[PDB]
Design a protein around this ligand. Sequence first.
Ligand SMILES: [Ca+2]
Ligand SMILES: [Ca+2]
Ligand SMILES: [Ca+2]
Ligand SMILES: [Ca+2]
Lengths: 160, 158
Amino acid sequence: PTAYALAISSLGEFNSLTGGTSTDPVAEGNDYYYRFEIRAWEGSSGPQTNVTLNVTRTLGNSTFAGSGTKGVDFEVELDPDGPFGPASYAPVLSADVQVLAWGPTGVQLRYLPSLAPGATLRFSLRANAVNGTNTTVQADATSTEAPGPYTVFETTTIIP
Amino acid sequence: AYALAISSLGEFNSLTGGTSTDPVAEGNDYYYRFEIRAWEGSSGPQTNVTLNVTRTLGNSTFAGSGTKGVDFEVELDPDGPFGPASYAPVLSADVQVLAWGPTGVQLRYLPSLAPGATLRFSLRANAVNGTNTTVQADATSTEAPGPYTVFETTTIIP
Ligand SMILES: [Ca+2]
Ligand SMILES: [Ca+2]
Ligand SMILES: [Ca+2]
Ligand SMILES: [Ca+2]
């Protein structure tokens, strides 16, 4: 018997914040973008609150870029009906995302509106590529109702 | 001289196409997808490009005895993101099944993998438990031993 559940997934790296094409490996000195989804269980008793992505760099030398400008350094898109309906991802309002932390080795982004059962959020995160060591990042999803943990690790090959 | 990369694409409700999933209800099949990606700057094609996937947490199991088109799929995008050629399934004889069991699978692409080209692997699993299933995906080639490793995690509803 389950009241609330959340899920996280890695979508890998891309050459643009939104759209564009996939990448990895990445050349040192170029920007690239990690994308992750947080997904609300369709069977949830209700909307979920304080749905938050935390990403931390665990290995390697690439750095999350900028001071945390929405539309440049990160994006958050809502698919209001998730995979259960034909509504597409669209960027959410700037006021709907709280930047709890933004720095070279980690970021934390909280979605302020409640997340309806089945709905999904896509987080896109700009990074500067650095070194011939793989960059690995730990991505964590939480809500108030579903603390998890829900954790993935995505890895990027960086060409020196 | 040579480099590889790996990425998770997350879970899907079909082997190819269909829609994304996760969470998954216990009792249902679902599919992990991973890409192995040949560095465009590589000196030449790479050999023995292998995906190894092993369960690190939870109770979901890789399904079936390892039948291509049912339990797994391997697609080649011959020019990767660098050109508009699409993914298409490779021939069965181009994929060596080094291992296939509930807790681990190993799939080797036998033709050489051209610089810039990408492979997409899809893997059927049976969902079990109210603990998250997490899998470790490793990419290797002869010329780029790595390893290159990601961890994808699935929420399973009891
Ligand atoms: Ca997942
Ligand atoms: Ca939708
Ligand atoms: Ca990757
Ligand atoms: Ca292509």
